[PDB]
Design a binder for this molecule. Structure first.
Ligand code: CO
Ligand code: CO
Lengths: 497, 497
């Protein structure tokens, strides 16, 4: 067998990216300032964090075992619980004390045959009293919100129609449905997309099979009152390339950024219209909604070249690290139109941005507040000379948050400091009567000066000032998505505005 | 109530002394080099580690909640398990989310009435299938060796005759007895010493009540074939001073270092002889034995002034940090002699030393190998300019280990590096047939460059070279005592030579 290294090597696991790999508890976290006492609930986040050194050199960040953090808040006190998802991969490699799963999304490189290849490392959401640890090549793994015990692979009481479940389901605040899909839904390289939904009682509602024009990565999607929308990243999969040990994904410069639109209820697969946006990278969706005229406004991060540069085109062509910027774009779509090509989008701000969140009380409807990560290259915002030698590689960088008011056009920027970077933020309604976008924002910070993580709590009245700074004595390695579960919400999700 | 701080402040909790306060697991620790595959067992160590910020400013290191680390070794792999002892203090303060116990060994400063004030933070030993987490003001707390679950306060099946159980019991390798005592055995300020022992079946054997000439600190003791020996540190307790908010301990320059000698079996309290060594500090006992003539050779660390300088005399007189050196001393005692004063001891080496370990297969008998911590002030051994600003205060420093062969006089010195310091080492017999002092030494290192801990594994054939270096991604705060429990020893303790 390929030799199992006994310590981590490579820039993807150096400095702040070095795995810690701890599970357990740290109660009564140190706090500078004061956590508002009305805040009650839990911030769940997930990070990729390899449990064992890979036999694949320079294994991407995206292929690390999912480790779940929960920050439990009550009466101005906070406790951390931390636990790895018990995926098939995790369990078998723990039993063997060596890595066994190979390249990202390529089963032909595995040292043993896996039934499920999930690292469950992308998102962690709440649904009907469980957490669902998500990875877009697999079904969810269900977990206990209180103990972070893994129950196992979840198939929605045998109703799950797809091999795959997106990392970005949407929760309709009015209907209380979880709206979902999976791509490569019948296996590696398939162009089948399964769109499906579940009512608040747990019963499956929609199930519509459709066909993608290419086998392209559909990481995120959008849901409006009457439509679901599938933006396709021009990374394309060829199973025959995989069989020879090649990458699951390869950039294709010759195709548009397809944007499928399907009626949300009652459709067949042939009802989908594959609109054609100018070539570019589909980043995360902030939110989408239908305006007065019934046209879809789709607000998402959008770049002009391959953000995932480590998977270049057929001839190895693509950008370098830190070259590609994504911008906050508005696309206008009309399901009635037979004109397939779409205009260039309008841009809402000029910042290099990603990881947009809204007040999810208006998800699928008109929103007027968006919170997002920014990466500002303006001199002095980040002390790169200090940070980069300590940072390792493989993960995106964010050196602030921004709050956009879409009515007024005002932008507030939170800057944690020259030697700190951020993860994705969460938004917490002040209380059940609060206005849209009024409450608290939390975000995990990497402090390169201390080589420790911190959890910042901000008030939306003034996003520039930390109301509290929760000081962890360990590193939480840069991660992906996270969610707030408020104690006052019986089903885990906030009430419609 | 005195206000509870919400983050740690003061030099006793700064830099490397900052509490981490984590409980749980880190399996498959990173290893540089190679852990010998024949090593099988567990290294248990305890550190003081305040779970909540104290309301007492500059609370000594000795008053921190005991947190147990177990390093589980098999086939060249190692896992860490870590868990706090569930003392009454720990549980009640966790329930309240604030500190409640006050000054070291002064119940008159507590905010609530405690039955048991143990922090269980001094030593962690194996006895009859349990761990015993030890603190000299209290009975032991019993724990599960595998899970580190706390069972609770342990009273030896209702046989425990004393309110106090020493942190330094001795395990007789021939008789398989645990030989014990407690001072302040009937409560605060009492001069009662209870000497007691347990046979390998768990039945109490000896129980002898005796009287100390002063209420002085008896931290360690010594056991030979026919005697038990009690060296008294000239720190003295006055309950009336405590009732006014003062220190439990106060140095007394006017008294000798008393050394009590009692027959090991069948004695009464009046059989004790209080010999009078020159005034000084009784450090840790390496070992004691009877020579050919029946005279006790007592080998221990011994200093000429108050090592615990933060508890000075009645007029605040005492030394400064880093001033007092302890040296490896041999005292000769004769229970037959009626001459109470003793000569100055001979010194075995010149190093400033502490934390002596022997091959416990010859405990209570003649030993010819001793391993110990050293602190070398010679320029370049420790880069003080780098280390001290990162170190915090409150804890002793050691920048190497030494191995003394007592027959040949040879000394080997392990120096981890200019920016590393050590804790107390453990010795592991190579196998059940190994000669005295032949095998492996392990020691926990504080790496001030990475702000991480490391566990070094050394072969006694060459103590200067690390065979392996186990790299923890977190800090284990400087701690106190630790022990090896070999898998091949059914009762947890090695077989006699
Ligand atoms: Co995502
Ligand atoms: Co001790």
């Amino acid at each position: 067998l390929p030799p199992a290294p006994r310590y981590f090597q490579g820039e993807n696991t150096a400095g702040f990216m070095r795995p810690v790999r701890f599970e357990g508890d740290i109660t009564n976290l140190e706090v500078v300032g004061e956590i508002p006492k009305s805040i009650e609930g839990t911030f769940y986040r997930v990070m990729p964090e390899p449990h064992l050194p890979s036999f694949i050199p320079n294994d991407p960040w995206f292929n690390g075992d999912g480790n779940i953090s929960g920050f439990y808040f009550k009466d101005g006190h906070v406790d951390l619980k931390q636990r790895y998802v018990r995926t098939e991969k995790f369990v078998r490699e723990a039993e063997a004390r060596r890595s066994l799963l190979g390249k990202y999304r390529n089963r032909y490189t595995d040292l043993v045959e896996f039934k499920i290849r999930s690292t469950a490392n992308t998102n962690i959401v709440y649904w009907r009293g469980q957490l669902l640890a998500l990875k877009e090549d697999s079904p969810p793994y269900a977990m206990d919100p209180e103990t972070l015990e893994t129950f196992g692979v979840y198939d929605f009481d045998g109703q799950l129609p797809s091999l795959t479940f997106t990392a970005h389901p949407k929760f309709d605040p009015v209907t209380r449905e979880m709206v979902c899909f999976g791509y490569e839904a019948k296996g590696d390289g398939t162009r089948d997309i399964c769109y499906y939904s579940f009512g608040p009682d747990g019963k499956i509602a929609e199930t519509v099979w459709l066909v993608s024009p290419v086998c392209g990565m559909i990481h995120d999607f959008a849901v409006t009152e009457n439509f679901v929308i599938f933006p396709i990243i021009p990374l394309v999969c060829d199973v025959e390339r995989m069989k020879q040990g090649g990458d699951h994904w390869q950039w294709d410069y010759s195709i548009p950024m397809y944007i499928g639109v399907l009626p949300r209820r009652g459709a067949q697969g042939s009802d989908v219209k594959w609109f054609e946006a100018p070539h570019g990278f589909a980043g995360h969706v902030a939110n989408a909604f239908e305006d007065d005229k019934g046209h879809i406004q789709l607000q998402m991060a959008y770049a002009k070249d391959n953000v995932f540069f480590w998977w270049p085109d057929a001839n190895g062509k693509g950008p370098r690290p830190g070259e590609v910027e994504a911008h906050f774009a508005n696309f206008v779509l009309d399901y009635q139109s037979d004109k397939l090509p779409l205009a260039e989008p309008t841009y809402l701000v000029d910042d290099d941005m990603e990881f947009p969140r809204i007040d999810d009380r208006v998800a699928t409807r008109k929103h007027k507040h968006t919170f997002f990560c920014i990466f500002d290259r303006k001199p002095g915002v980040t002390d790169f000379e200090f940070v980069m030698p300590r940072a390792g590689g493989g993960a995106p960088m964010s050196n602030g948050l921004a709050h956009l008011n879409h009515e007024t056009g005002d932008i507030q920027r939170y800057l944690p400091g020259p030697r700190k970077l951020t993860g994705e933020c969460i938004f917490i309604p002040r209380n059940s009567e609060a206005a849209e976008g009024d409450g608290y924002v939390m975000v995990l910070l990497a402090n390169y000066e201390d080589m420790c993580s911190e959890l910042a709590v901000l008030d939306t009245k003034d996003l520039t000032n930390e109301v509290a700074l929760i000081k962890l004595p360990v590193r939480l390695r840069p991660g992906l998505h996270g969610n707030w579960v408020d104690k006052s919400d019986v089903d885990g999700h906030p009430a419609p505005l």
